Assembly symmetry: D2
Homo-oligomer: 457 residues x 4
Amino acid sequence: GTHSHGLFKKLGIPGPTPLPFLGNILSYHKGFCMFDMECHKKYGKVWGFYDGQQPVLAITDPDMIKTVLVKECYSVFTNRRPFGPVGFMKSAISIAEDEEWKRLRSLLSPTFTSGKLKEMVPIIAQYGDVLVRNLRREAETGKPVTLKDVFGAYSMDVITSTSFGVNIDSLNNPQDPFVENTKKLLRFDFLDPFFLSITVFPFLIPILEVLNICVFPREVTNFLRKSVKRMKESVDFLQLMIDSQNSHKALSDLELVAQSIIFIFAGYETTSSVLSFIMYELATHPDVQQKLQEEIDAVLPNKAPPTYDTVLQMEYLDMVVNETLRLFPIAMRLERVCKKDVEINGMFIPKGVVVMIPSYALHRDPKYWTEPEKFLPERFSKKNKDNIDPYIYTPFGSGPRNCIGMRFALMNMKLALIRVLQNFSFKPCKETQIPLKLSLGGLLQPEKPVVLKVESR
Amino acid sequence: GTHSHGLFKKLGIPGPTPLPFLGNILSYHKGFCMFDMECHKKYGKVWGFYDGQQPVLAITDPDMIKTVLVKECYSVFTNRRPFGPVGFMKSAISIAEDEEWKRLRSLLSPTFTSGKLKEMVPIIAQYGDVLVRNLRREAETGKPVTLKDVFGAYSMDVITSTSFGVNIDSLNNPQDPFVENTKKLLRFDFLDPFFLSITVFPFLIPILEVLNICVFPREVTNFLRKSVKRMKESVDFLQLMIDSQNSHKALSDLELVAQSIIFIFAGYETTSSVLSFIMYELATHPDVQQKLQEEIDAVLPNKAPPTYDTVLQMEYLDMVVNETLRLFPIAMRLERVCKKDVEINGMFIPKGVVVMIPSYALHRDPKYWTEPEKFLPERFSKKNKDNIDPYIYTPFGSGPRNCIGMRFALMNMKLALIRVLQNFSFKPCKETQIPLKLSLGGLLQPEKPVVLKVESR
Amino acid sequence: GTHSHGLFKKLGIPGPTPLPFLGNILSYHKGFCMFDMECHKKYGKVWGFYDGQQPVLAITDPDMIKTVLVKECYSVFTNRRPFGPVGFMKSAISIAEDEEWKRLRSLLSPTFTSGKLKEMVPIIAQYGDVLVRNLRREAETGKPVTLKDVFGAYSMDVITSTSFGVNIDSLNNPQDPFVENTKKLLRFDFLDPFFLSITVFPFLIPILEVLNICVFPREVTNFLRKSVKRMKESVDFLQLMIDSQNSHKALSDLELVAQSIIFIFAGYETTSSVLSFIMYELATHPDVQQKLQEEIDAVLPNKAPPTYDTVLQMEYLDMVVNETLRLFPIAMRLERVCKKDVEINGMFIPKGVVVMIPSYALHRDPKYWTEPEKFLPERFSKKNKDNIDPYIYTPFGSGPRNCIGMRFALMNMKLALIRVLQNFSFKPCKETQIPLKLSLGGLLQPEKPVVLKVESR
Amino acid sequence: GTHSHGLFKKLGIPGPTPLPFLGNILSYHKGFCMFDMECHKKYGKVWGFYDGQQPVLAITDPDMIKTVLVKECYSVFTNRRPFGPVGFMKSAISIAEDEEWKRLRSLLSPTFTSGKLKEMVPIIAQYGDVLVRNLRREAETGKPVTLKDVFGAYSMDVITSTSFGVNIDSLNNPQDPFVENTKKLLRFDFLDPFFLSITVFPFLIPILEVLNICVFPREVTNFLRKSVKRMKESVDFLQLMIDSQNSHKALSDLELVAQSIIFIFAGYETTSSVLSFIMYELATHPDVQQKLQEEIDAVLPNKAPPTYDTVLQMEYLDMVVNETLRLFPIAMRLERVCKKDVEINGMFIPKGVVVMIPSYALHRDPKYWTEPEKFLPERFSKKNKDNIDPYIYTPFGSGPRNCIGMRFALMNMKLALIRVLQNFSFKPCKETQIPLKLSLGGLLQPEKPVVLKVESR
Ligand code: HEM
Ligand code: HEM
Ligand code: HEM
Ligand code: HEM
Ligand SMILES: C/C(=C/COc1c2ccoc2cc2oc(=O)ccc12)CC[C@H](O)C(C)(C)O
């Protein structure tokens, strides 16, 4: 039961010692984030562990991180860890591999350009107003608001109308067929019962794929696949893709449905979780919240509606976002499969190892960050935005295979915050978890949901 | 690839010849019902086929059927075909085996007595009124009603309030947390992609059970399991069970949740489908519908509300129900695992064969029924209700392991029909499928749903 | 990954704490024997552990052992742990279950009677002479003999000629087709790579059975199955079985081949291993060897050939055999599946637990045996053969399902020893492992094989 | 159950229609060879079928064959069909993939050069004499010789002494530890029970690999792996490899054991089967046998021993060998996995299709061969050795990935024949199967083994 459990002692790379079959997964009982810090402390800058029989080589040196993520990306480190069972979602850009991915990353890049984004801002802006009106209704009546629902509803109101042209007040219309399905599109908990069973028996993935079982539910996907058929057959992501097949080989039909779904998956709980973390930090730091409220009113006098250009104007906002993402990189880790034998920056890495960059832990490394547990938006000021190594702070990853939706994600979250801070202020409650505790699960998210008092300005 | 594909040629039992691995499942392309008639025609009164490597021995002789279902039930033919993956639903009475089942069938029988049923009629009767008001709203406005929704909603309005004490206008409140889950509780299509893959690779069931995959969704069950915890901790099925553990070993906690779930599963789409089939036949036979409307008004003058006793009074109603069930035994087949070697009525049956009684086909046998394709409620008159062999007409099966919910099912459906016929009459539409065609799937149900015109009296 | 890992803490039974998926198997790294002593020491007289997800309840009280092995044998504890993949060897008496086993234990019992055995002694006796002549050839030339080969060859020379009528000097004819196959029939190492993988993924057994993979090699079995066809079609086990189908249902054809194979498996390495252990103890205790040589010459003056009756006459011989089996019960454990819920001697045992009696450890319990590490044949004298509890000393198990081949095994080993001690004396070598160390594997057998000097008398 | 069973109807490529799960394997009941001719007849020059869910695209045009085997070999068609479970034999040159294979094909090519072969001829020649003396012993006594044993023994006598330096008269020493193992190294019957079960459930391969089950037996490999350790640590293949790691990365240790094993596998039953087929054809064509006997005596007057150079001198010999290989290409098919999307000679081939060249059938195509059922060595005369398309006659395949052992195989077989024809003549028997019938199994080999009369000259 120990296939390749000698690999790291052989190469002389240090690490914790594995059990048979389980490898090191018993050590995930405190989450990846906590597991990654301990190993950074113990074994220094490079170590290895086993997810089952799967060797994983952690790296924390920025020259070496760059070679993985940037330089040898097309040659050696092109794909993320095999992830299954996936069905037709094998065509989604984030699961596809090698040349199929390159084709798709090309076919979809001109959809995430600044120009196309600047054209999407009016759509996104309209569900800001929906959010505020869904918030004043919460704030008028004395009652502690649970952010995850009001924000979770907002990330939906945008995902839909930006990648299908569908305009829903999902909070107020929780039953439009569309709203049920797409809310079943949550990020995957890789320490939940199933995915841990996949790591111990990845020989079961082919079995599951054959049994037509999918991690992307077999019923959600069936609804959207035809719903797009009704859309196609009659300034958003779906349209910009339909264009990119009125010309690599143009995006097929099913290939298009796959991207739209993977966009929801990659965008829904990511955005919602970060918006929450930001409001938690503004609430538990009233000075920061006021300084930002003041910067918002300056650029936008008279509760003016935010634009693409006035969003890019506001620097304290940028610093708050970026500092929140430093504390809470909701990906936790970046990973690439090493598909040859290589020697990068003087270390031999055998074929088939998963190379892993422990973001969460590097973002909270005392060796690159002073007082790294503190919400301190000033590390990202124009004065200090220079002593920050872009291969240590990677909330969206780096390289050709980084977050294709980064500018969208950051513009989306910034408009929300702008309109919400314009109108309301956020004070803690007694029930607000202080200090916040992170779920020991496989998702970077708060143990207990964030609830705060909302008052109107 | 042919383990035991010689068994039936060895014993001298005739049948169609199997492919390797698939056995005879390619022959299910016209549904079990159509497959069963052909084999009855061809090979006579006893034949054998293979579901994968699983031999199944069909029988159509009533002395022999009785031995299986009645006599040697506890000794030889106690359990239905192994059905998985099931998780904790292995404790449901209909999936449990041998002594566990006997314990449960005992612990739950005094819940389906006439006395307890007669006490449940007022509850059931109240969602009759909900049904009619949900129907007049359909009938006031000129528009063809699709029965499956108005009736499907009714079977829900009763399942809930009779096995949990929860009172929902599920049609008008399609969002009460309770209504979403319990509507995901549909009968299993055993010719759908998954269950056919189970028949070819039943060696995959243990794998699925270990991966914590369930045929009873892992999320529906999680909602109900605690929802009962809130119910327990503060004249219906749930209460009568809570009593039966204030005393075999009293029903455990989880064992109770299992029964309530299996009741929904066994009762929801069964009832809805039969109510539809009955309305289809009343609509396409206006003479029968009028004769029954007339019998209803007699017993219940002035749109009087039906009672337990006036339901049992109405004989034409009984004949319509029973004749509909003859045409549409929504189970199609009865099955028992042969758990020893035996010789019943002079035939050797080896251990491990699935013995199967082809209800649908026997109900439409020209050899026991004249003009067996015709809706003819008079075969069930007190004059002819005698020339009917109870081992040929088995819409609820026979023996210790027949439908524990039979009197409930028949009383439930009869109250619906009574109140609906009192107030409305049902005429076809142009879009009404005539003749009705049965879905070639694994469920006895109409290809196209039943839509009819509803007019008010 | 912890299905039923709470069962023993729930019932209040103590034990070591399990890892997920692995249960306690990491604790088998010192063999079952050493694992069983520690648990006897620690948790007292009853404890529980997990082979994967499989709970196993150890018991060491003789009233309770008797209920399991003797009283409730037909009712509750009929079968040994499911053992697979087995193919047609599911018909072997030792793997078959419930009524199939009862049928076979009946059909084969009159083959292991004293009368039939007494008729087999001349056959067995002839390969005594073959053994001695294969030994004098070893002893004439100065060279340390490795017992396992000379004895292993003898157990073969008897297995063949007693269950097929085939007369081979397997040592001198190591190529007769028959000799190759039947030497591939070794007892199963349940801590070897494969069987440990079965305990962690017993959901893989059905898969293996379907892939036609067998633990009883698919080629050895193919040779014997037809070799018996040539035998049948033209005073030993094969003949006595062919008779028992010239009359429960008479033994089928394949059922007969299965028993003959399972006899080889159960008899080959068992006998060889015990004969070795006995010679080791005679060699490292020269007083015992001389006292037995002297008893042999008395009963059999002049190197007389042993008979059935003079074998039963020799009591010191009996004591040496029985005391060797106390130190080395080559089964180590006895096991029965608990197939209902029960309460035996005031302990609840849930359905599906494997109940296990730790022979090796009880035989070396200081609480029933003084100086239990010492070879002391006198504990079995007619004076002390009474203070010995037959449910503590179970080298062949007890009850209806004990070793059907016991009298044969004991008569077989005794004739070997008699003829070998008549002619030779056995002195250690420098290379003789002293003290003997037991293999930490899954078989009770010496780490290093036994080599001793043989000199002629 | 029909993943990608539409691919060939979609692309417009014709073929037989598949069953679910089985694809077309029911059509293998007459062997690949017979299946391939029918499809060549029916669908013309390009067709498609399914091995399970695995699409296979047959091609029979020589420009297109060349692109697959020669041109786009490194780019598109580098590997043979995934074949498992393989364990460490994944390092054998013939199973390894992509760059690992290129490394190995380089590291091992200078071992199959003419120069190295010419140095191996004296070794090979010595077991010619062993063969003849093992043959005169057969021919002196009047008795029909079964070629497969005398020749099978010869191919062993050479495999050993050319790839390990071990000199065995395996016929006369059938027990040297070495001889038992290496005779268990037979070519794989891909229509036997197991491998057909692999084609239907290739999702079971990962399971088997994890269970440590190997198609290259787990015991044969264990013997050789250490036997080489004794060899290494103290003019043949093993030595030439030990050199090639006294310098791509030099051949590792285990990588060397793997090649030696794969050499036995690729060389043992191949050579034996072809030598038989040649003797069958010489015996059933006495004119050819005499004309070759006469050519042998010319070049080698006085039963002179054959040399490397006099072997290359004899042209009728070449024609007999080459014409036998035309009738019996013991590979039957060549295959390459299509690892991108491509268009070769104007046909689109999707990623993941197995491209297959049906050698056996092309060699017996009436469209490239007149009277293609006839043993006619003259088609290979220097006059006609030109009208023969090297992509139609491919008994060793073509391209960078053709038979690395071709010159060895052809020199080996030619020396055997030379020395055997020098001394003996071969006449049929009454028991000689005439006409020869090919086994309908998955190996190209005679149904009934070849037996002929051997007389001495
Ligand atoms: C706060 C919000 C978000 C965060 C923190 C985030 C973060 C990330 C990270 C860390 C990765 C892995 C990159 C790598 O491997 O280096 C990733 C990949 C990706 N994200 Fe985002 N993301 C967010 C929102 C979005 C949105 C709105 C989209 C909309 C299209 C999106 C689409 C994707 C895609 C398609 C990939 C995979 C791209 C590829 O594999 O080529 N994400 N994201
Ligand atoms: C028209 C409505 C229904 C029909 C036609 C129907 C029919 C059947 C049939 C044919 C069986 C198999 C019996 C056998 O194997 O002989 C069965 C079993 C069963 N039904 Fe019904 N049923 C209906 C409604 C219900 C309802 C309302 C319940 C509510 C509790 C219920 C609970 C069960 C249970 C628990 C079993 C299995 C009992 C056991 O295995 O011991 N069914 N039903
Ligand atoms: C020193 C030699 C032997 C020893 C120590 C030995 C010991 C054992 C033990 C401990 C068991 C388990 C009994 C139980 O579960 O209580 C057993 C079962 C069995 N043994 Fe022996 N045995 C020996 C030789 C033989 C021989 C020569 C045969 C020849 C037929 C044989 C045939 C069997 C069979 C068939 C069973 C299973 C019976 C059943 O399951 O009903 N054994 N043996
Ligand atoms: C009559 C005897 C033989 C015949 C007919 C034969 C035929 C073949 C064929 C058809 C192939 C597939 C080539 C392709 O895919 O194009 C092959 C591959 C191969 N053969 Fe032979 N062979 C014979 C003897 C040998 C011998 C003696 C060796 C000794 C080393 C050998 C080693 C190999 C190897 C290693 C491969 C795979 C090479 C690679 O995949 O790169 N074969 N053979
Ligand atoms: C190496 C990884 C990177 C995560 O890349 C994403 C992220 C990260 C946050 O949200 C995302 C949405 C995405 O959507 C997509 O389609 C594709 C990628 C994606 C896996 C992260 C695992 O959880 C853990 C903690 C076990 O390593």
